[PDB]
Each structure stands twice: as C-alpha cells, then as structure tokens.
Amino acid sequence: GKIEEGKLVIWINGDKGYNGLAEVGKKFEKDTGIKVTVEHPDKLEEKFPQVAATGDGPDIIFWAHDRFGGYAQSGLLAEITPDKAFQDKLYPFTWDAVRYNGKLIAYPIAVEALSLIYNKDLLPNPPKTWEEIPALDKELKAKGKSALMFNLQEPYFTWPLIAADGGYAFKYYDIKDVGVDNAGAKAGLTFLVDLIKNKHMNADTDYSIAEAAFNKGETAMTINGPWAWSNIDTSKVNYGVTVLPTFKGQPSKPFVGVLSAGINAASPNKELAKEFLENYLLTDEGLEAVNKDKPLGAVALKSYEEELAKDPRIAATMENAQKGEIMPNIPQMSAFWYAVRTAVINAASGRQTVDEALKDAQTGSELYRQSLEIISRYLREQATGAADTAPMGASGATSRKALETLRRVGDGVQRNHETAFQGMLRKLDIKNEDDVKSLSRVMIHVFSDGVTNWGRIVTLISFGAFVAKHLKTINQESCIEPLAESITDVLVRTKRDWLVKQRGWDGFVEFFHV
C-alpha cells in the first residue's frame, strides 16, 4: 500500500488538544520504539476522504462522529473490534454515536456541546432569552462593549438558534424529510439576520474574531465548546459557562458531537492503532493529558468522566447537550452541513433572503435521497418491467412527477442510444457488485466534462437502466440497488451546485413538461 508499515500517523483538528495528544504518542513511542506522528492539517474533514480514497492518508483520523458514516460508506474506515471489557469502559450512548449499519466504525472520545460563555464582570446575570439580547447590546454599547459575538461562518454555531423553534436536519432517519426550511428554522435565522441588520452583530465575524473579542473583554458573551476554555483561562477573563438562551420560549438545541477516532481502512497498522487508542489514549492518564491541553468536554471513559462531571462547566455542557440532539452520522451529513453553511452566510450577508437561502439548503440537503428515490425506482422497474407500488412518501409529488418525466424522456433516449449502450457495456463488462464499483470512477471522469444539461443527465440514468436490465437478465438483480446508488452518487457530487440552481428535480419536471 501507500501508508507506511510500522509507524502511526494521526490527524486531529487544530482547535483540539493536539500537543496533549502528542504527549500520549510520545509515551507509546517510549514503550514500543514505534514512531507516532500527530498532525493537524487544514480542512482536515475534507482532506481525509480525498487522500484516503487513493489508499493514502493517516492511520488514525479524529473528528466529530457526524462525518464518519460517510467515510465508512466510502470504504475508508476499518471496523473496530473492542472486546467486551473495553466496551464496558465507555458510556453506551457514545458507542451508539459511532455505530453505522450495525458495525462500530470508530472509538468515541468525548461528548461536545456548545454553551453560552459569558464575562461575569460585564454581565453578572446572563440573558435567559435571545429576545432580550438587542436591548442588552444597546446597554453595553454605551459602555464601549458588545453583548454577543460568535462564529457566523460555521453553521454549527448558529444551528442551536435555528433548531430552537422547530428547525431540524433529518426527521428521526428519513433523509427525504428535511426541516431546514420550515417556519421554525426561518424564524431562528431571521432573528440572527435582524441582529446583524440592527448592528448587534457583524456578518463577517468568524471563530478567531469572536474568540479574540471575548478573551480581550470586548464582548460580554460568546458561543463555543469546551475546547475554547483553555484560551479563556489564559486571558484571565472572569468567565462562566451556562445554558444557551431560549428562543420563542423554547431551548436552543445544539447539535451534539462525539469526538471520535477512526482507523484508515488502508492502514497496515490497524493493530498498532488499536493498542494506542485503547491502552494509551482512552485511559485516565491519556485523556487527562489531552484535556489539560484543550478540554474535551464530557469524556466517553466512565472512570474519568466521574471526575470531570463535578466541574460546573461540564454540568453546563451536559445541560445544553440534553436540550439538543445527537448529530446523525449518515453519509448525507456533509451535504447537509455545506447547504446550511451557505444558507447562513448568504442570509447574513444579504446575498439571499432568508426564505430563498433556506429553500436552497432544503433542496441541497434532500438532493441525494430524492435523486436516489427516482433513479432506484426507474432502474428497478426498467429491469423487472413492473413499477414499485410503494408510496413515494415525503415530497412524493416531486418524486412521482420526476419519475413520470424520466419514463417519457428516457424511453426515447434508450431507444436512440441502444446501440451505443450495447457497445459501452461490452467494453466495461459489468458482471457483479465489484464491477459496479469500478463503474463509478469511469462515470465521475466522463460526466464531469462538458456543459451540464438535463438531456445528458437522462442519458446517464438511461445507461443505468440499460445496465440494470442486463444485471436482471444474468441473475444479478441484487446489483441493481448498488448500481442506482452509484449513479446517484456520481450525479449528486459532480453536479450538486447545478442541480440546486435548477431547483432540483422540480426543474427537471418543468424543463420537459407536456
């Protein structure tokens, strides 16, 4: 392979205690004589799938658990196999966060939730509601201070307000039912936008700016997680950590993350990685070394959490976590976050209205499942000759009309391209599940080139139907669903922006109408 044998390379995000983690690596190195290297690459969560796909990258990847389902689905993670005794050392619900399709795909490290952090010298009694913050900012501005600054560039930080009055990601998971465009989400984001319009916040505020402002005593409040407490300690700001404000009488609902460590499927060092994670890091001493660098939050290791739990900052973290919800770990989470990130930034800046911004995020978040519903149904009915009688469910009008349109347009495409498809198939030689995998790379290569239009998309899906018919004929009907998922994957990740701009499959229906 490409990853070196007999050594460990670990990647972790730059806002975490990577120096403390390096200490743990040194202790492992001292015992074993085996080199451990801790790195904190930029855009880590995007770099890992890029390099791991080629069979390269680190032996161990750290991130919140929401990204790991996508990694596992893409074949990038090893199943982990802790023995019963080790599993019993960590809280069951932390294991639940890293279970994907019935398998454990990472070691859980710690539970993270955003809290309200406030400067007790400026604001001894922090607001219980978001609604009182405009007036509070006016009081503070007279003193040369501001009420609240937090990172507006990452949707993680604005999510608790969006979800407060009823916004949600995926309905508990139906990846076709998304709640980012409902009345509650709209209310939450509008309030944020109004704060900006009324000069109580600045749309350009990012993590570094908000952190510097709070730690310099310029703003009374910020929103952040336990990793941020170390830098505040150093600043000597007199701070407290408490429950997030309510919105319209409802608790803010942070998305709860479990910091987790996965093992690269391509690593020749899986046993070394196991040893390091189970017997060095996930121990009282290992977590303490990391926690002393940047606080982890409520750790997954029971023995050590019983100590941390006595910390009021940790109690506050858990209180907020209990009002929030554990993030899904499904593969669509990345698309969801990118969609909502764009919506918040565009609404904040005025590039889009709140309504249009959240509409696009809805469409972006539902795109994979909506597309899969259509493509899967088309391929299966083409292969078998009979339609699926199951109700379409959520956004059923769109799915149904898109499928109707696809049948009508696809009929001609398959008829006209029949000879071309026969030739393509003979060259590719798709005979089983392994072949459909290889087919993906070919498609991502050819489909990326040239002007995008609905005609070309129908041709891609029509070839899919042609291949599905073939798979059925040679008694490989089980390969049709992974074929549909592969085509959907290619479509959605090469044409995402285009598709959202067309308003997804609604654009498709309108384009070919009558």
Ligand X SMILES: OC[C@H]1O[C@H](O[C@H]2[C@H](O)[C@@H](O)[C@@H](O)O[C@@H]2CO)[C@H](O)[C@@H](O)[C@@H]1O
Ligand Y SMILES: CSc1ccc(O)c(C(=O)O)c1
Q: Which residues bind ligand Y (CB under 6 A)?
A: 442-443, 446-447, 456, 459-460, 463
Q: Among 112, 137, 288, 373, indicate the residue that binds ligand X (CB under 6 A).
A: 112
User: Is residue 13 near ligand X by the rule CB under 6 A?
Assistant: yes
Structural Rg of the chain based on CA atoms:
25
Stretch that binds ligand X, among 131-139, 154-162, 301-309, 490-498 (CB under 6 A): 154-162
**What, of ligand Y, ligand X, Mg ion, none, does residue 112 touch, CB below 5 to 8 Å by kind?**
ligand X
Q: Are strands 36-39 and 325-326 parallel, antiparallel or unpaired?
A: unpaired
User: Is residue 152 near ligand X by the rule CB under 6 A?
Assistant: no
Element (H, E) at 112: strand 107-112
**What, of ligand X, ligand Y, Mg ion, none, does residue 155 touch, CB below 5 to 8 Å by kind?**
ligand X
Dihedral sign for Cα 118, 122, 125, 127, please. Answer: negative
**What, of ligand Y, Mg ion, ligand X, none, does residue 485 touch, CB below 5 to 8 Å by kind?**
none
Residues 45, 341: contact at Cβ < 8 Å? no
Dihedral sign for Cα 207, 212, 215, 220, please. Answer: negative
Tell which phi-psi region holds residue 177, choosing left (phi > 0), alpha (psi between -120 and 50) or beta.
Answer: beta
User: Is residue 57 near ligand X by the rule CB under 6 A?
Assistant: no
- Residues numbered 67 to 106 that lie near ligand X (CB under 6 A) are 67
Q: How is residue 343 written in tokens?
A: 């919506």
Tell which phi-psi region holds residue 202, choosing left (phi > 0), alpha (psi between -120 and 50) or beta.
Answer: beta
**What, of ligand Y, Mg ion, ligand X, none, does residue 446 touch, CB below 5 to 8 Å by kind?**
ligand Y
User: Is residue 337 near ligand X by the rule CB under 6 A?
Assistant: yes
CB of 178 to Mg ion, least distance (A): 15
Q: Among 96, 131, 154, 485, indicate the residue that binds ligand X (CB under 6 A).
A: 154
**What, of ligand Y, Mg ion, ligand X, none, does residue 463 touch, CB below 5 to 8 Å by kind?**
ligand Y
Identify which of residues 206 and 506 has a Cβ nearer to ligand X in the complex: 206
Angle between helices 354-384 and 396-428 (to 10 degrees): 50
Stretch that binds Mg ion, among 93-101, 221-229, 285-293, 360-368 (CB under 5 A): 360-368
Q: Which amino acid is at 41?
A: P
Tell which phi-psi region holds residue 120, choosing left (phi > 0), alpha (psi between -120 and 50) or beta.
Answer: alpha
Interface positions with Mg ion (CB under 5 A): 360
- The contact set with ligand X (CB under 6 A) reads 13, 15, 45, 64, 66-67, 112, 154-156, 257, 337
